[PDB]
């Protein structure tokens, strides 16, 4: 039924390795170069990545900022407003980044003064003039 | 299994089955009702029993009867026909026996034997048992044939056969019981011990060993399931199909380490691409925190556009931050994962040059086993006699085998050193020619009405032929002997003062140190009281080892053995023989093997009769004339003494059938 086990052959495999003469030292040699050919390209990678990791050194610990936990505020001061209208212009409608752009607002509260205050702040071309990039 | 049917097993019948020559000789009964057939093999079985309870006395007709009981002992006429047909064909009343009624006052017939080997005596003793004009013809000054036993003093030693190769069916079971023969169990543990003379770690012995079964089931997977036969026309034989397995497992080998490293590189390549991606953002990562960092400088109060860059970019760093975090992260698992591939890698390679030395030794032991380079067996056929071997401990002959065929020669005509060089064979009879092996000139002439020939195949192989067939064989039968493959295998019989081995190892290995020369000296056996080591040469070794003096050959030996036991353990050997069968010209060879090219059905072409043509043209169909028995015509048992012997049983029977009719098929 099948051969046993620690044994490999199959019928396509058996036909390669007879063909000719010397198909064996043939096959044996083609797999015993494509073996060191994969087995060099490895230390060449092995190398360009360990010159990358180097580069890499220091980590980016010399440019991480501090924590800001400031607690969700209800209220829309003047200023909060312009840094709202001007992360708009810039970031379309990431929520998110708008959100942790002006600091004191949720998420939500964001998407709600894109409604309330719709007309006033034109938001409309606002948001048209960030699609324009 | 016992009893009734254990007789029938032990007899290599089928218990509760009719065979296909019971078929024929009792044509009636098979084509019968099965309660007849019961009633008939219950019979038989009983008779064999009976026989075999107490082989040392001829069992009558009439002591049979005695023994059977109602509704079997009504008919009396299948009680005869049974105990005939088995006395007929040898299964009962064969080999040593005493004779209750001596033997028919004037003989029918005559008939020539040639070679008193085993197949031989055997043959001769029934057809004399039978009432025939019985001579053997014998170019050695001894009987035996392949069956030579060593003796000088008080060692003793087979040359020839030493193994009865299991009781369990083994007509020699019976032989042993009527013979005086001392019989040795072998203990199957073999030790192996390397060319530089060391033991074999049990570790390795193991890991070899295994393999080698292995690669063995392996072929005969190759042959049946993937019908790999034919190569090039020619036949496969075990050798090429043993070395195609074995590329094929060092393809595997390689396939696996390939596509592990393979592994490796797809990974490694990933991370490249993580760290190149990751360099690319530390850059801007360092360029953003400085536009920041310049934003803050701005000291306040400043204006909300100036404040928004502040807060803006604040964002942004934080933001390419988390990236960067988790790009360190992914970076960890893809750093582990090729520190786990490069702690397991597939194995090195398939077998190491020590390993491959080792399971060299396996395979000339089955050269050994084949008395042949397995480059020359068949894959398909080599071993097709497997399902007819023994069951039971393999067991030797303490007081050398040549006590049988010694025992089977008391009261026969046997003509010593007389060569058979011609048969002719004709219609109305045969005349043999031989001539006397000292005076060669001298001339012998035998007429016979059959003559039975129990040459060994190597000799039937001649060419020029040692003898000629007058007629000349048939084609059939030629083309049967070209086909067959008859090997060698040789012994060295080392005699000493003291047992310097392990005496509770019967057998012990010693290891090449080429594929070349696996056979040469490989296996030593201890096996009698006496201090004797044998050692044998197999394989392609048997054929080369020929053509060099003993004295070499013992050299050889007492290095290999002092490599192993010490250099002042191993004495010199008091009395040493080196066999050379395929020199011998009564031999020519050892035993017979299933050659490429060959099959089973050659053997049965090698028992076929011949039957010479018509005298007078258009006389009827003569009766078949010449014969043959011997070890290499028996299909089932090829190369063994038992085989021989039963070969020899077999003829007698159809010859008696043939010259004195069939009584007991009324
Ligand atoms: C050679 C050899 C053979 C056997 C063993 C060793 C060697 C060395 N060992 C072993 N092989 C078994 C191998 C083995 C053992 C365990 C597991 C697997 C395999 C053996 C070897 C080494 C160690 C132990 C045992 C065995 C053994 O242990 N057990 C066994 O049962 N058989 C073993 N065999 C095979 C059997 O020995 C053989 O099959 C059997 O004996 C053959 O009986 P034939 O068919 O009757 O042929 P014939 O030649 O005897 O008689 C013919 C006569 O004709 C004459 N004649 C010729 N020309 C002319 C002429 N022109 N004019 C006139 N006359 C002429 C000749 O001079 C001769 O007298």
New binding site residues.
């Given amino acids: 039924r099948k051969p046993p086990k620690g044994m490999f052959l199959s019928q396509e495999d058996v036909e390669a390795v007879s063909a000719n003469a010397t198909a064996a030292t043939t096959v044996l040699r083609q797999l015993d170069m494509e073996l060191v050919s994969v087995k060099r390209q490895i230390q060449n990678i092995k190398q360009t990545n360990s010159a990358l990791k180097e580069k890499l050194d220091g980590g980016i610990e010399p440019y991480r900022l501090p924590e800001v936990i400031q607690k969700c505020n209800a209220r829309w001061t003047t200023e909060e407003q312009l840094l709202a209208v001007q992360a708009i212009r810039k970031y379309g409608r990431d929520f998110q980044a708008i959100s942790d752009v002006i600091g004191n607002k949720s998420v939500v509260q964001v998407k709600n003064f894109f409604v309330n205050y719709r007309r006033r702040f034109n938001i409309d071309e606002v948001l048209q003039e960030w699609e324009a990039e | 299994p016992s009893g009734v049917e254990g007789a029938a097993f032990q007899s290599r019948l089928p218990h509760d089955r009719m065979t296909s020559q019971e078929a024929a000789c009792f044509p009636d009964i098979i084509s019968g009702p099965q309660q007849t057939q019961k009633v008939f093999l219950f019979i038989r079985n009983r008779t064999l029993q009976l026989w075999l309870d107490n082989p040392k006395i001829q069992l009558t007709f009439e002591a049979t009867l005695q023994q059977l009981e109602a509704p079997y002992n009504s008919d009396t006429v299948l009680v005869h026909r049974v105990h005939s047909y088995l006395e007929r064909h040898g299964l009962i009343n064969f080999g040593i026996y005493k004779r209750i009624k001596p033997l028919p006052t004037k003989k029918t017939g005559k008939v020539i034997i ?8 055997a043959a001769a003793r029934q057809l004399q048992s039978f009432g025939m004009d019985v001579t053997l ?4 000054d001894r ?6 036993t060593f003796r000088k003093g008080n060692y003793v030693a ?8 299991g009781l369990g069916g083994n007509p ?1 079971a019976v032989v042993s019981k009527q013979v005086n023969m001392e019989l040795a169990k072998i203990k199957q543990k073999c030790p192996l011990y390397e060319a530089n003379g060391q033991a074999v770690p049990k570790e390795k012995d193991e890991m070899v060993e295994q393999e080698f079964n292995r690669l063995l089931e392996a072929t005969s997977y190759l042959s049946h399931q993937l019908d790999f036969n034919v190569l090039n026309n020619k036949p496969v034989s075990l050798g090429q199909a043993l070395e195609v397995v074995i590329q094929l497992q060092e393809k595997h080998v390689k396939d696996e380490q390939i596509e592990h490293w393979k592994k490796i590189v797809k990974t490694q390549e990933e991370l490249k691409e993580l760290l190149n991606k990751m360099v690319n953002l530390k850059e801007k990562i360092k360029e953003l925190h400085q536009q920041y960092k310049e934003a803050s400088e701005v000291k306040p109060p400043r204006d909300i556009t100036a404040e928004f860059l502040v807060k803006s970019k604040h964002r942004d760093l934080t933001a390419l931050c988390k990236e960067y975090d988790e790009l360190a992260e992914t970076q960890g698992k893809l750093e582990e994962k090729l520190q786990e591939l490069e702690a397991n890698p597939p194995s090195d390679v398939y077998l190491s040059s020590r390993d491959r030395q080792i399971l060299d030794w396996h395979f000339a032991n089955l050269e ?4 042949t380079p397995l480059s020359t067996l068949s894959l398909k056929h080599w071993d097709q006699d497997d399902d007819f071997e023994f069951t039971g401990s ?1 067991l030797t002959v303490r007081n050398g ?1 040549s006590c049988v065929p010694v025992a089977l020669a008391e009261g026969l005509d046997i003509k010593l050193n ?4 011609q048969v002719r064979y004709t219609a109305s009879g045969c005349e043999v020619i ?1 001539v006397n092996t000292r005076s060669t000139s001298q001339t012998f002439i035998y007429k016979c009405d059959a003559v039975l020939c ?3 195949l190597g ?1 039937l192989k001649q060419q020029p032929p ?2 000629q067939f007058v007629p000349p064989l048939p084609e059939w039968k030629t083309s049967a002997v070209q086909r067959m493959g008859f090997g060698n ?3 060295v019989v080392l005699c000493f003062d003291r047992v310097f081995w392990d005496p509770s190892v019967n057998l012990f290995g010693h290891v090449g140190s080429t594929t070349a020369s696996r056979g040469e000296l490989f296996l030593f ?1 201890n096996l009698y009281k006496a201090p004797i080591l ?1 050692a ?1 040469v197999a394989g392609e070794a048997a054929g080369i080892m020929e053509n060099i003096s003993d004295d070499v050959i013992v050299g050889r030996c007492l290095a290999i053995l002092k490599g192993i036991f010490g250099s002042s353990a191993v004495p010199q050997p008091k009395e040493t023989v080196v ?1 050379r ?1 395929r020199a011998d ?3 020519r ?4 093997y299933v050659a490429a090219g060959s099959s089973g059905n050659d053997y049965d072409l090698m028992a076929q009769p011949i039957t010479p043509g018509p005298s007078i043209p258009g006389a009827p169909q003569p009766i078949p004339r010449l014969f043959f ?5 028996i299909r089932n048992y ?7 012997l039963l ?2 049983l077999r003829e007698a029977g159809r010859i008696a059938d043939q010259f004195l009719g069939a009584m007991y098929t009324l």
């Fill in positions: 040639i070679g008193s080997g085993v197949s031989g005596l013809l014998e170019a050695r009987v035996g044939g392949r069956v030579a087979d040359l020839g056969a030493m193994v009865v190769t020699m050994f086993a084949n008395a393999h085998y007389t060569a058979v060089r031989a129990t040459l060994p000799v040692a003898v295998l040789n012994k056996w044998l044998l066999s069968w010209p009564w031999a060879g050892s035993y017979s028995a011997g070890e290499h015509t090829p190369a063994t003494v038992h085989g021989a070969s020899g």
